[PDB]
Short mmCIF file of C-alpha atoms in Angstrom, two decimals:
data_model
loop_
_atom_site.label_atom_id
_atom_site.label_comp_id
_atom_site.label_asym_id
_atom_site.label_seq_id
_atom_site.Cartn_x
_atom_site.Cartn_y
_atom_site.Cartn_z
CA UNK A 1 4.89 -11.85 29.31
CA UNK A 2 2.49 -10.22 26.96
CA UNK A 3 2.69 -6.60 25.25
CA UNK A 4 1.02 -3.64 25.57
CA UNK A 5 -1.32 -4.01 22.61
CA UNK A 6 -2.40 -7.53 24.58
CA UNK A 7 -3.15 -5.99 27.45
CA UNK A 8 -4.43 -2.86 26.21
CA UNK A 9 -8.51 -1.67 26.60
CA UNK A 10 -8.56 -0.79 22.79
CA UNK A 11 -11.35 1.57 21.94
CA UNK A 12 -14.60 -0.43 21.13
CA UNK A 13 -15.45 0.97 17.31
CA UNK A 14 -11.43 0.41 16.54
CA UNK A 15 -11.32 -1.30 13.17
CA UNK A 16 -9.96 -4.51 13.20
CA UNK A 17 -8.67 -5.85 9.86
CA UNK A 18 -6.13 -7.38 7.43
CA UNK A 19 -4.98 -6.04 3.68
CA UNK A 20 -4.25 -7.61 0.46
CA UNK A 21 -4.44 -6.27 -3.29
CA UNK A 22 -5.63 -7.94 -6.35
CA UNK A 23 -2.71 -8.42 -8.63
CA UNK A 24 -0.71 -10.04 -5.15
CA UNK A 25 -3.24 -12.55 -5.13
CA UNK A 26 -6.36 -12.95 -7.58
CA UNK A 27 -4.36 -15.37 -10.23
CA UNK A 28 -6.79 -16.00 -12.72
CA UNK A 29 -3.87 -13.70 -14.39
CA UNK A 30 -5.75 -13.93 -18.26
CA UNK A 31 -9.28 -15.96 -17.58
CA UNK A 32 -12.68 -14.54 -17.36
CA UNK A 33 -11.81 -11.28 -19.97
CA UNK A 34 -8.68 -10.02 -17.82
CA UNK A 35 -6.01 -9.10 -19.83
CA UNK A 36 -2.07 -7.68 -19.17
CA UNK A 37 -1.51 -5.34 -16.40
CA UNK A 38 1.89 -3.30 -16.66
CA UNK A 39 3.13 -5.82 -13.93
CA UNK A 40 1.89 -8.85 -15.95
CA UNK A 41 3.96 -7.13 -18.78
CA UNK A 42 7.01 -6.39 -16.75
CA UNK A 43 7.33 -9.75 -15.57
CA UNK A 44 8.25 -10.98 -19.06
CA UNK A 45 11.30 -8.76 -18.55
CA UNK A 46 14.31 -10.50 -17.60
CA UNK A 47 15.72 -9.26 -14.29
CA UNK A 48 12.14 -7.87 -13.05
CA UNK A 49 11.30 -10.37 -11.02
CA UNK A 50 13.24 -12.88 -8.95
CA UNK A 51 12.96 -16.45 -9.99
CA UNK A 52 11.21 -15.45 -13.13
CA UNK A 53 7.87 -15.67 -11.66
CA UNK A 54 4.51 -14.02 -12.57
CA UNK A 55 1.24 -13.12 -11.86
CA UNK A 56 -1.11 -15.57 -13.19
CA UNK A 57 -1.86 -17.81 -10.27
CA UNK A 58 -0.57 -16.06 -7.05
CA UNK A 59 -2.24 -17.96 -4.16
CA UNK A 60 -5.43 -18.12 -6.91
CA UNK A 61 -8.25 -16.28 -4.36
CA UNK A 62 -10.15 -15.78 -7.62
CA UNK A 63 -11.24 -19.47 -6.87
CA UNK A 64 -10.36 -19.59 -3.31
CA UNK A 65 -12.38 -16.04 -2.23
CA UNK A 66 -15.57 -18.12 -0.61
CA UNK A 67 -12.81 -20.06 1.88
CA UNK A 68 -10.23 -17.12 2.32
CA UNK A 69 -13.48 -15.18 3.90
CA UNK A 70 -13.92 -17.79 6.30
CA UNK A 71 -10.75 -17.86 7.05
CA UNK A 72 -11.07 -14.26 7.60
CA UNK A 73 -14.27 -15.04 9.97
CA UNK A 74 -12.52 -17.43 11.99
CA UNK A 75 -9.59 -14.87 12.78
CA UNK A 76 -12.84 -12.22 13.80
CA UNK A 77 -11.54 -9.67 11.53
CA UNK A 78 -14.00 -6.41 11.56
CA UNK A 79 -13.19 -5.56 7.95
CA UNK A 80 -10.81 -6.78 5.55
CA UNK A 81 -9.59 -4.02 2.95
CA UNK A 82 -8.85 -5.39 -0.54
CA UNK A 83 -8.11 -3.76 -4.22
CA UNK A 84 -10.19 -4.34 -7.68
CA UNK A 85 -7.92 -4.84 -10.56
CA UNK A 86 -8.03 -1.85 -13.32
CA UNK A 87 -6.89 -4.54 -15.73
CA UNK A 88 -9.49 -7.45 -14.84
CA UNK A 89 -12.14 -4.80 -14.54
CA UNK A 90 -11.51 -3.14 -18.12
CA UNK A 91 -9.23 -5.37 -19.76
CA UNK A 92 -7.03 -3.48 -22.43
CA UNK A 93 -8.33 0.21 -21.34
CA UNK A 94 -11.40 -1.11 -23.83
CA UNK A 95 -14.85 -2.43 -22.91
CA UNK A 96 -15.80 -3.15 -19.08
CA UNK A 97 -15.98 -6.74 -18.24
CA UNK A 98 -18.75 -7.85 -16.44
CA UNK A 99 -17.50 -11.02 -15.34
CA UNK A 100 -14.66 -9.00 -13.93
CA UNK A 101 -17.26 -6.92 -11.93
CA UNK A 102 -19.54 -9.92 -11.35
CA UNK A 103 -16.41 -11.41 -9.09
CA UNK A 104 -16.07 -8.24 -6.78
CA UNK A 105 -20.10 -8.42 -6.24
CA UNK A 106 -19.51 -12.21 -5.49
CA UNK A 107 -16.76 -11.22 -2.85
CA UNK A 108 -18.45 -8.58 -1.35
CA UNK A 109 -21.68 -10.55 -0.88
CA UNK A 110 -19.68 -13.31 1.05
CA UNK A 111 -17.73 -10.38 3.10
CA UNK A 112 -21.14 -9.14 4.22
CA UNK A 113 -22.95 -12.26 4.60
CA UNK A 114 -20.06 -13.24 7.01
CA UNK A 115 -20.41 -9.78 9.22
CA UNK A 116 -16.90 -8.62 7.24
CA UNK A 117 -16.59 -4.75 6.35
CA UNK A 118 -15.25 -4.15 2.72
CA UNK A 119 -12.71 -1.61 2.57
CA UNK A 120 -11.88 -1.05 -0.99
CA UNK A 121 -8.78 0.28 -2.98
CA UNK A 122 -9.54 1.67 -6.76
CA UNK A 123 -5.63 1.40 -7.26
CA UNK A 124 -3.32 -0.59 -6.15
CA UNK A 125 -0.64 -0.80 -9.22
CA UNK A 126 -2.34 -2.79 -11.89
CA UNK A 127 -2.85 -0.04 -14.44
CA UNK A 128 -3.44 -2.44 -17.65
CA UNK A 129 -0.39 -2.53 -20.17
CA UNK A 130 -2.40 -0.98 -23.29
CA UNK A 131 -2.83 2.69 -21.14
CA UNK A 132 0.92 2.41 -20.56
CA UNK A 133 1.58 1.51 -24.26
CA UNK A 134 -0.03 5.21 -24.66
CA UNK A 135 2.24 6.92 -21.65
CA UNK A 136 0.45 4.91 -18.89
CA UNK A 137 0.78 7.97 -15.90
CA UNK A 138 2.92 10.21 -17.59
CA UNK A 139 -0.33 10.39 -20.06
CA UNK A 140 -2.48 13.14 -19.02
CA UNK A 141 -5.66 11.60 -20.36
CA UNK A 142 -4.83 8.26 -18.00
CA UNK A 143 -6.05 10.47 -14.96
CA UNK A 144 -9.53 10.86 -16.84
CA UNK A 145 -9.77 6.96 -17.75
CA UNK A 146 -9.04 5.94 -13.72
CA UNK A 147 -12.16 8.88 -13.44
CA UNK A 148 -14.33 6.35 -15.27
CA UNK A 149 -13.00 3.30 -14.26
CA UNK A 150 -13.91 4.60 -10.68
CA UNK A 151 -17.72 5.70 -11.31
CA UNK A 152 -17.83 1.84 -13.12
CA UNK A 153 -16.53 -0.01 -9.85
CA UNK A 154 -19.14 2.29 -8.26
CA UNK A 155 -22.18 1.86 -10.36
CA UNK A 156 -21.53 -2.06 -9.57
CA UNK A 157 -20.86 -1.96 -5.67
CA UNK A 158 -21.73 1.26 -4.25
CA UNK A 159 -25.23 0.01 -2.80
CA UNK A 160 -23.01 -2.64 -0.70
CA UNK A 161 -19.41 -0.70 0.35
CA UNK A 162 -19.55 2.30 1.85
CA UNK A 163 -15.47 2.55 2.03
CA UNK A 164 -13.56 3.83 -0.69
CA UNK A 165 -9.78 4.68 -1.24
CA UNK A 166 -8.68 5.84 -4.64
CA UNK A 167 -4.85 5.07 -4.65
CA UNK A 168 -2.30 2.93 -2.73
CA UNK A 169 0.86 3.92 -2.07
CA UNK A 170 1.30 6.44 -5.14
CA UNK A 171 4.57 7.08 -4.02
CA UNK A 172 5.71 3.20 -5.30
CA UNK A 173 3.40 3.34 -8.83
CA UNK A 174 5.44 7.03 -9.67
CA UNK A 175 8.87 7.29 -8.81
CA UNK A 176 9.68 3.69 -8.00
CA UNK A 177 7.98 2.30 -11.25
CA UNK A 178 9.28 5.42 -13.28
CA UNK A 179 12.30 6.39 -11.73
CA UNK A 180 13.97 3.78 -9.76
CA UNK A 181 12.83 1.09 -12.43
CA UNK A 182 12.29 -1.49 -9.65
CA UNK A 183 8.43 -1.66 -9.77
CA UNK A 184 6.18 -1.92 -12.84
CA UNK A 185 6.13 -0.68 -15.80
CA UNK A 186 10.36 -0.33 -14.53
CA UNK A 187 11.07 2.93 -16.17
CA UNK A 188 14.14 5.19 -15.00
CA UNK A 189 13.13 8.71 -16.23
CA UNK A 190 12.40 11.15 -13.44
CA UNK A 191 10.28 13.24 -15.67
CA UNK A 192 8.33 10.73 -16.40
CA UNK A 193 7.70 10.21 -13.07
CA UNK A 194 6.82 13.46 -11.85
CA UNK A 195 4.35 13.36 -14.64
CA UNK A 196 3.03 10.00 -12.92
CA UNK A 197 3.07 12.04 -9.20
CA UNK A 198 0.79 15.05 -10.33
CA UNK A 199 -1.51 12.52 -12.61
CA UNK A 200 -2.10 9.93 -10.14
CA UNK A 201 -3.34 13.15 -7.77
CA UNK A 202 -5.53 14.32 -10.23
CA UNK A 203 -7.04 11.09 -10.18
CA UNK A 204 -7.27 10.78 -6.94
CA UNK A 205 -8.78 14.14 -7.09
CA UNK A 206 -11.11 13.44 -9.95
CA UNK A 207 -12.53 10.21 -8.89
CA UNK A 208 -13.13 11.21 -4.93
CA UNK A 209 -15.49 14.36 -6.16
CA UNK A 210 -17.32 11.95 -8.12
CA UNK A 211 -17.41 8.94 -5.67
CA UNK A 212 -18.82 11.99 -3.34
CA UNK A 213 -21.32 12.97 -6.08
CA UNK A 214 -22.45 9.20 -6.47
CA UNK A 215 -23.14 8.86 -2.34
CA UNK A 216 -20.00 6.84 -1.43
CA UNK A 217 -20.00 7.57 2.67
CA UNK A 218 -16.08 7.41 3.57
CA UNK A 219 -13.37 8.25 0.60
CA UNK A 220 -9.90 8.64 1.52
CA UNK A 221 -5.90 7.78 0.23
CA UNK A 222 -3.43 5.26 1.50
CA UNK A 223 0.15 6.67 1.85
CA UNK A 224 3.28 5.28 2.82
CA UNK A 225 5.29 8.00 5.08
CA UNK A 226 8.14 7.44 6.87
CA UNK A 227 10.25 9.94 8.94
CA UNK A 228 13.49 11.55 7.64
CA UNK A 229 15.64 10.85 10.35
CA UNK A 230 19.21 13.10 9.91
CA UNK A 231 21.84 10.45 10.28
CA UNK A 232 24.06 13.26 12.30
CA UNK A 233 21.29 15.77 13.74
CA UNK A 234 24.16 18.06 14.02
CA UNK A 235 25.08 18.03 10.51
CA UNK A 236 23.89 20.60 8.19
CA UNK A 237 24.65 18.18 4.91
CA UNK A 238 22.29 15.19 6.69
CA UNK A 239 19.65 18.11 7.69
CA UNK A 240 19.53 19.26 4.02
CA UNK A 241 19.36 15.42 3.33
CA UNK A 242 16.78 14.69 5.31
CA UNK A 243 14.46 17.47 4.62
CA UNK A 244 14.88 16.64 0.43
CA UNK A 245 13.89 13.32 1.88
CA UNK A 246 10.88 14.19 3.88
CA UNK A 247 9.50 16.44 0.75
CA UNK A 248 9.67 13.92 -1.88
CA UNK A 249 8.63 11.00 0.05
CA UNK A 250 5.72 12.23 2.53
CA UNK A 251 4.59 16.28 1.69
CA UNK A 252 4.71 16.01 -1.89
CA UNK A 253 1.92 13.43 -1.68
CA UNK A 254 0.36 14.80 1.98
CA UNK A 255 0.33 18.70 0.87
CA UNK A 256 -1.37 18.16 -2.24
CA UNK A 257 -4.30 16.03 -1.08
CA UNK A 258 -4.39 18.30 2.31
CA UNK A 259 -3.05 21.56 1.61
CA UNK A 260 -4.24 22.07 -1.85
CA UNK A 261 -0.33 22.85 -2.91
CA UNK A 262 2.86 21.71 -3.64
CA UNK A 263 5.88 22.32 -0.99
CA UNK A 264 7.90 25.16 -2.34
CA UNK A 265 10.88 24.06 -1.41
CA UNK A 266 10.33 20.76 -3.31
CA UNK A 267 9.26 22.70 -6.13
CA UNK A 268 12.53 24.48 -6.00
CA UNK A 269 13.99 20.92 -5.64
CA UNK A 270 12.80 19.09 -8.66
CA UNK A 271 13.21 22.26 -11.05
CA UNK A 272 13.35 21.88 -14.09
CA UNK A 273 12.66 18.08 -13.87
CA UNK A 274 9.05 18.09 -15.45
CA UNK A 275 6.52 18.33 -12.72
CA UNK A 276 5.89 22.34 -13.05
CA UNK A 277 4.74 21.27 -16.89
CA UNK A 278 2.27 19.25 -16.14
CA UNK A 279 0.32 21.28 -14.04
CA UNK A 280 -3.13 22.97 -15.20
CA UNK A 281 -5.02 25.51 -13.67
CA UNK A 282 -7.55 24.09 -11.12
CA UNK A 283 -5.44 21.08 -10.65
CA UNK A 284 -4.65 21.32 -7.52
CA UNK A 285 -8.15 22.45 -6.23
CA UNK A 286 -9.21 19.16 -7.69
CA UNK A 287 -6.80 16.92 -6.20
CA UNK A 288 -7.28 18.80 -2.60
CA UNK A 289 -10.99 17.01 -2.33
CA UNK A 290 -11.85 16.85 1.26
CA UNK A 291 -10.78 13.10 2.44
CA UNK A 292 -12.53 11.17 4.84
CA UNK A 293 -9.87 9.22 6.22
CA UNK A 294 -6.41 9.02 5.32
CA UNK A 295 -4.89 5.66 5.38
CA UNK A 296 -1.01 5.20 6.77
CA UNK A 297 1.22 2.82 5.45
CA UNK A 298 4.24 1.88 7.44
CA UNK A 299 7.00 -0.64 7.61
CA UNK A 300 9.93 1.57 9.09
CA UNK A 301 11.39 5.01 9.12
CA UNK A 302 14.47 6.33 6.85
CA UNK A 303 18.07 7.20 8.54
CA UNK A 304 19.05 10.20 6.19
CA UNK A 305 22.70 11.27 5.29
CA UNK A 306 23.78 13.80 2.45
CA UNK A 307 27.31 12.34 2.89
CA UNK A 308 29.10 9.18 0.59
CA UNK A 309 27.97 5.97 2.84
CA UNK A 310 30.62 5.38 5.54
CA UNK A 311 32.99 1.71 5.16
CA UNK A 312 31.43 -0.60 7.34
CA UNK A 313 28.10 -1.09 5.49
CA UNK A 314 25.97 -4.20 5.23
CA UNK A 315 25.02 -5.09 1.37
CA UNK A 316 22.10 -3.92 -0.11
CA UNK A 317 19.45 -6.07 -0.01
CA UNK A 318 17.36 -6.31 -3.45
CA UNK A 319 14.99 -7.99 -4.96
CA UNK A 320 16.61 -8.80 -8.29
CA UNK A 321 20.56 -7.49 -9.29
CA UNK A 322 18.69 -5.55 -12.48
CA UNK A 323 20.26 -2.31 -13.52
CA UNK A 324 18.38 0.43 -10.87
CA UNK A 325 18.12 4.07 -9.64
CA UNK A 326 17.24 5.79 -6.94
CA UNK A 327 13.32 7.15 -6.90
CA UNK A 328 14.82 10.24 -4.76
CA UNK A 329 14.27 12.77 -8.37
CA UNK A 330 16.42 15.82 -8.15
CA UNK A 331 18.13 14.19 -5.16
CA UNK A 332 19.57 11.05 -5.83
CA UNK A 333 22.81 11.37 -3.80
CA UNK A 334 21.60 11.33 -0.67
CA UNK A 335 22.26 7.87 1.25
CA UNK A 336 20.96 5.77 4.09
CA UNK A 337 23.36 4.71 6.55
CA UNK A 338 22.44 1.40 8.22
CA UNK A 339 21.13 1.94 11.79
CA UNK A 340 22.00 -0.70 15.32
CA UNK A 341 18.49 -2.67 14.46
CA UNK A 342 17.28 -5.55 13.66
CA UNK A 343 16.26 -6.20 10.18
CA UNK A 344 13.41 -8.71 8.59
CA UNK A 345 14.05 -10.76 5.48
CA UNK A 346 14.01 -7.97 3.14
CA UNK A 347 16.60 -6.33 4.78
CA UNK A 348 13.72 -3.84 6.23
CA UNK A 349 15.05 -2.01 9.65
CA UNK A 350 12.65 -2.72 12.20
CA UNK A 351 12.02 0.50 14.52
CA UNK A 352 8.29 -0.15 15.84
CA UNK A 353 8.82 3.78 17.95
CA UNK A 354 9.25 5.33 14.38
CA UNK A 355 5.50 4.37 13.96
CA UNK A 356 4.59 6.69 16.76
CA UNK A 357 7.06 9.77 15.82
CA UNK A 358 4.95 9.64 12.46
CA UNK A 359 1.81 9.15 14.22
CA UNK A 360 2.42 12.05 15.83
CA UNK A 361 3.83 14.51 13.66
CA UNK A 362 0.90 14.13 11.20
CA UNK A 363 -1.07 14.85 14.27
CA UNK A 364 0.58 18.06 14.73
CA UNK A 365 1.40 19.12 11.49
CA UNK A 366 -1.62 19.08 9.91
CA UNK A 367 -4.51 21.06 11.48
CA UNK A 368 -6.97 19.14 9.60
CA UNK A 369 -5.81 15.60 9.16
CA UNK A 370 -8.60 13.38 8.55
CA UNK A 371 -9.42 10.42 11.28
CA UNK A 372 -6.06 8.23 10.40
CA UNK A 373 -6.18 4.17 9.83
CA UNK A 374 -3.24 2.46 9.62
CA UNK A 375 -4.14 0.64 6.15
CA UNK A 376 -0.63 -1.74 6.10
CA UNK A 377 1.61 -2.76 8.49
CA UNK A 378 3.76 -6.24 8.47
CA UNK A 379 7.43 -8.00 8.16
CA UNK A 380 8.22 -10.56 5.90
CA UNK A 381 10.63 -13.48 7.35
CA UNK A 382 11.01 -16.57 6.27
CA UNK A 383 8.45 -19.63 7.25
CA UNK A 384 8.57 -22.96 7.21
CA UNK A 385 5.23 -25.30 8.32
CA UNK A 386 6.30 -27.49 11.14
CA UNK A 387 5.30 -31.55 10.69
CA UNK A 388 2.65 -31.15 13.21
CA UNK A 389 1.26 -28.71 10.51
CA UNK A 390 1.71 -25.03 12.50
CA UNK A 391 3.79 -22.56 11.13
CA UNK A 392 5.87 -20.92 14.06
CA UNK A 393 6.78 -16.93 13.24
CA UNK A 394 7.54 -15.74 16.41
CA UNK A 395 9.68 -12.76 14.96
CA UNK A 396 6.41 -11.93 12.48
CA UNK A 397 4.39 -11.82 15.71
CA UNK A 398 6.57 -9.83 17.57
CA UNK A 399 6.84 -7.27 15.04
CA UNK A 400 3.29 -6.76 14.44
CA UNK A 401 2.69 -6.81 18.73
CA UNK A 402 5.64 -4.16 18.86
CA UNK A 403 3.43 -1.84 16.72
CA UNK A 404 0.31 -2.62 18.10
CA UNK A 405 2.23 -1.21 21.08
CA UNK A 406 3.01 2.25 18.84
CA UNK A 407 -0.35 2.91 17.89
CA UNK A 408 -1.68 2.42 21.66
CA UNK A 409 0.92 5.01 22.96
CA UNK A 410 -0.23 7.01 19.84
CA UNK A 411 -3.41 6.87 20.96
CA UNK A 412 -2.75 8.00 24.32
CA UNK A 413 -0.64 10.86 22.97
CA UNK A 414 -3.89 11.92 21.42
CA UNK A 415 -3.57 10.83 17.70
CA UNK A 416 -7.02 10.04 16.34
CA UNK A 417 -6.04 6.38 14.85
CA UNK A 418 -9.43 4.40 14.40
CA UNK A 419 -8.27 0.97 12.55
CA UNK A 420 -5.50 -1.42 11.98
CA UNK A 421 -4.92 -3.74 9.13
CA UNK A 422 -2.46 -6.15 8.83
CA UNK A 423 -0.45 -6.93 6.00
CA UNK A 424 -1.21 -9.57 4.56
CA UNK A 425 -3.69 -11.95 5.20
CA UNK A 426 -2.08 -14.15 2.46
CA UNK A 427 1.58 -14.70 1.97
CA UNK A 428 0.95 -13.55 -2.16
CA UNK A 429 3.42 -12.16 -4.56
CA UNK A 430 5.51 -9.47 -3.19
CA UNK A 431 6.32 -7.53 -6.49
CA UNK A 432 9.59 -7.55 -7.79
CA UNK A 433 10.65 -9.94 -4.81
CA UNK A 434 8.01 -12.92 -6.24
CA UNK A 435 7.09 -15.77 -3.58
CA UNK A 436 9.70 -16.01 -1.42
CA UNK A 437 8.86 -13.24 0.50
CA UNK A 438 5.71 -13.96 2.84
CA UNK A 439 3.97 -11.32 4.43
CA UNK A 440 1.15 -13.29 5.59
CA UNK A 441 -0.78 -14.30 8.33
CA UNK A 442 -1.98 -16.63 6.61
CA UNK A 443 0.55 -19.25 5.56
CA UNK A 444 0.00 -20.34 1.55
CA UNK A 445 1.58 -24.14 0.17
CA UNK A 446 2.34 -22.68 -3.28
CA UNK A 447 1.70 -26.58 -4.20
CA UNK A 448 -1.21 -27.43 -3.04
CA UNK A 449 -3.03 -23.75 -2.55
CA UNK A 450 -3.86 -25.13 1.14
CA UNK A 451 -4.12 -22.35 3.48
CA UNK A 452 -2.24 -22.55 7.05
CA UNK A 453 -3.04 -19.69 9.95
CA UNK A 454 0.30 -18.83 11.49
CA UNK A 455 1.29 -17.94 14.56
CA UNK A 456 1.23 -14.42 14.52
CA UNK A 457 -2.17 -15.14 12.85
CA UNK A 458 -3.37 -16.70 15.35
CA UNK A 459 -2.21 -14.21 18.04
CA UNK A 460 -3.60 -11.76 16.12
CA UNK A 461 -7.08 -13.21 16.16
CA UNK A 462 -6.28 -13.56 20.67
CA UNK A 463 -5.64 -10.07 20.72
CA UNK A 464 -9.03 -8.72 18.39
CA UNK A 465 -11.38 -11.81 20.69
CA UNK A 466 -9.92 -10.04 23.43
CA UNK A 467 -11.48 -7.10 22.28
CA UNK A 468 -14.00 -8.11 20.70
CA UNK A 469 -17.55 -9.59 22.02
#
């Protein structure tokens, strides 16, 4: 029997895609002028990264972009949304690199040549290692660089893409790269990343009035949110929880960009803890820019408790066993009690209705939420390619069809989502987790470079034919 999403009329303009991000998997790590990223830095730390691997070759698309768009073509993708790399495109914070910009005018040729809608990121984590050397985002003056940087991507591709997002998932490059320690550059000092939260706005703020003075049509932000689910409802202490919760992780990144302010309660929250110091008048006008989209990134909701975890408690499941904290700043003792669900490789719950609860409450939250996309949605579990060739991931499949099925019911609750991109279309490096964890629908030999369409891929591309002509 088939699912919802199969079966479903889907709206005719929907936006059918699939997502990657440079540093996950360009390679070309240091040719052609690009130099150290923090995460090309960070994984000569011992402990960062599991199995000791790096960055430099990934699933090497800097060679491999011509044949990864046809791949892209053959799956009838309507766009496919990608990143540029801060530290190919000005190596070392220094000069611009035109061969650096000379590849993302290659790629974006081929994507239009072959009928394929670029949807670009600005930011997606590879803030080069000499602007962290100098404070990286707790550095004022890094907000102003990322300005620049922006207007230079723009000056090169602006007459071809029309789509523009500053930032992905700020939320992982501030507290969990400067608080938990777990991402790039793997700090643990919560004013340090509070410094990175209100800097990374002002960028975003920064470079989205300028895109809009240099004619860029749609400008938006990609955000992970989740929902703050109160392991007891009844219980003030999981209440309290939850709602410390649901202010760091989705309103102090939504209010700012949409309301033009900080929560006050997590203001009150984080006192004292170094985000109050860093704010200048007019900041926050800038970073409230009108947005033309905002893009959701989702992968499963949060069970909240303010209590000490209860006995019977599956293991954490972590990338690497390095020293860590917890990115929750000013409330690090809350807990997340393990829920009756399934769970993919990475130890991820799986709760495809959570997709629709937070579908819906941006919906009704926020009287002015832009037209919403969901920019990244995907499971990783392990693959193996069959010796007829195929690579059978039936629980990848039915993970991505369950929330197909949320965003249809979404839909019909009357939440304006116009696009859907999978992540990824390339298994690629999956930060501190390396290679092991594939996210693709697109299966990658890390041998040969030989590109396999999986399953779910190929699903994927029945469901889009099916409504597509």
């Amino acid at each position: 029997m088939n699912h919802l999403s199969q079966k479903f009329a889907w709206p005719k303009e929907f936006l059918w895609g699939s997502a990657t991000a440079a540093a996950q998997i360009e390679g070309a790590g240091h040719s052609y002028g690009k130099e150290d990223s923090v995460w090309d830095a960070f994984a000569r730390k011992e402990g960062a990264i599991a199995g000791g691997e790096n960055l430099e070759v990934a699933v090497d698309h800097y060679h491999r972009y011509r044949e990864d768009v046809q791949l892209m073509r053959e799956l009838g993708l309507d766009s496919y949304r990608f990143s540029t790399s801060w530290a190919r495109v000005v190596p070392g914070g220094r000069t611009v690199n035109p061969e650096g910009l000379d590849f993302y005018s290659r790629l974006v040729d081929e994507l239009l040549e072959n009928g394929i809608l670029p949807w670009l990121t600005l930011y997606h984590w590879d803030l080069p290692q000499a602007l962290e050397e100098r404070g990286g985002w707790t550095n004022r003056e890094t907000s102003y660089k990322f300005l620049e940087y922006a207007e230079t991507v723009h000056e090169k591709l602006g007459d071809r893409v029309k789509h523009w997002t500053t930032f992905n998932e700020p939320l992982c490059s501030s507290l969990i790269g400067y608080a938990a320690g777990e991402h790039a550059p793997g700090r643990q000092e919560p004013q340090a990343a509070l410094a990175a939260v209100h800097h990374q706005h002002l960028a975003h703020g920064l470079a989205t009035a300028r895109l809009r003075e240099l004619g860029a049509e749609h400008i938006g932000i990609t955000l992970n949110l989740t929902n703050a689910v109160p392991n007891n409802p009844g219980d003030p202490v999981d209440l309290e929880a939850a709602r410390r919760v649901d202010a760091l992780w989705n309103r102090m990144y939504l209010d700012p960009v949409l309301r033009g302010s900080y929560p006050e309660d997590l203001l009150e929250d984080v006192q004292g803890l170094g985000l109050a110091e860093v704010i200048e008048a007019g900041d926050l006008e800038i970073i409230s820019q009108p947005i033309d989209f905002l893009g959701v990134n989702h992968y499963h909701d949060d069970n909240v408790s303010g209590h000490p975890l209860p006995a019977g408690q599956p293991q954490p499941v972590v990338p690497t066993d390095s020293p860590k904290s917890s990115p929750f700043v000013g409330s690090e003792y809350v807990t997340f009690p393990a829920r009756d669900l399934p769970r993919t490789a990475m130890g991820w719950e799986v709760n495809p209705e959570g997709l629709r609860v937070l579908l819906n409450r941006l919906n009704q939250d926020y009287a002015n939420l832009p037209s919403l996309y969901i920019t990244e949605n995907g499971a990783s579990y392990t693959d193996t390619v069959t010796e007829a060739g195929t690579v059978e991931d039936p629980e990848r499949e039915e993970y991505i069809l369950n929330h197909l099925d949320a965003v249809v019911r979404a839909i019909a609750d009357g939440v304006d989502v116009r696009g859907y991109f999978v992540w990824s279309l390339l298994d690629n490096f999956e930060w501190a987790w390396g290679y092991a964890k594939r996210f693709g629908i697109i299966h990658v030999d890390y041998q040969t470079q030989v590109r396999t369409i999986k399953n779910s891929g190929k699903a994927y591309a029945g469901l889009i034919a099916a409504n597509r002509t």
